[PDB]
Amino acid sequence: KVFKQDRILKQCLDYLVESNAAVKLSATSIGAMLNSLAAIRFTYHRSVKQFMIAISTEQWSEMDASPLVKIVSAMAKLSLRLPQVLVHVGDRLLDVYTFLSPLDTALVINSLQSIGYGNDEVLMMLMRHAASSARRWDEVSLTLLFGASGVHRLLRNVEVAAPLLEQAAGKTSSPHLRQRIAASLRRSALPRALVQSSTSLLTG
């Protein structure tokens, strides 16, 4: 209903935190609640921060891929930056990255960019996995990936950015996204020849 009464949800979250119920809830339930809170731009971030902190490392250790990506996406859309939640997220990603769908990979990459994630190994290996499975990427997934804030940071190697660029040239058909990708290629650290060829393909 896009209903915005944040006092009611604040009372509900206070009851959730006080009852120590965040240590027994399911991963998909946590993701659904966080996504619902983020979909309406919840105001009181202190309650959400306490609720996310209260959950234990046991839950973080064996979360499935999709609830985990939902949780990190809801964290990113709520402008939450937590130093100790992100290390748990990173080790869980290290464990279960191979099962991510392409749209999950794009969501993870752009959400981690949106929160200014400082780790580079996890980002680099996620980008490598995305490059390996480039032949299956849809249109919305490419928009989500190449629409990330610091996308040019991730376009480090030619191997990790060649199939993604050719797939974007083949599939993406929006002038603004192509211009943004060309600008990111210009600001990237790729070899000059590949940048020139990709810019030629995308624009013109």
């Binding site: 998909t28 996504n35 619902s36 939902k70």
Partner: peptide, 30 residues
């Protein structure tokens, strides 16, 4: 299978395991 006799059982029960395998957002609400 006739022995099931129209009883889905645990595979079609309401348990948390079966309720934790879908991504609908629980928006409309049962």
């Amino acid at each position: 299978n006739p022995w099931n006799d129209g009883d889905a059982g645990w595979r079609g029960a309401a348990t948390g395991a079966r309720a934790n395998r879908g991504r609908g957002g629980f928006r409309r609400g049962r």
